[PDB]
Amino acid sequence: MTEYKLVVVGAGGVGKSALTIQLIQNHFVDEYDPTIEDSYRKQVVIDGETCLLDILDTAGQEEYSAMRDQYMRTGEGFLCVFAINNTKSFEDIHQYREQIKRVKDSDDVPMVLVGNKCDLAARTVESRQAQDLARSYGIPYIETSAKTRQGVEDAFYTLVREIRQH
């Protein structure tokens, strides 16, 4: 079967690892041990077709900025995440997209813009802002709450669809 290498980029603190976890792990188990094999693979059925998701999550390693190109290059699709209560992370998106466009050496790279809700703080980025940014890039916009598992599958599955139709 087919395997999709999906990469989650975006400033630190936006909840990238929480998304990845929410998608891959078993939410019905008391203990989770990321230091155990294939805690990055997941077999799923999308639009009938059965594929294998390989998520490349580097949360925590944001500071190793020069290792970024290497990490990205193998990705086939990208989730550009940002926090709805963090305007900075939102304004960071533009450069993340440009970095991906450069390393993949292409102008048509499959990606999705993801606005994640980390806590209960005051939202500072309204979805309209995001919708418009997402539209200017010609890409899908999905809001999530990895904390309540809302929109997570939707964000990844949408990215996979983007890859299948590229």
């Binding site: 909840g15 690892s17 929480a18 990845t20 976890i21 792990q25 203990e31 989770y32 041990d33 990321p34 230091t35 805690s39 999550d57 580097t58 949360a59 925590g60 390693q61």
Partner: peptide, 11 residues
Amino acid sequence: LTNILKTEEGN
């Protein structure tokens, strides 16, 4: 760093 973080956000 990645493992410690996933462990803190997944438990």
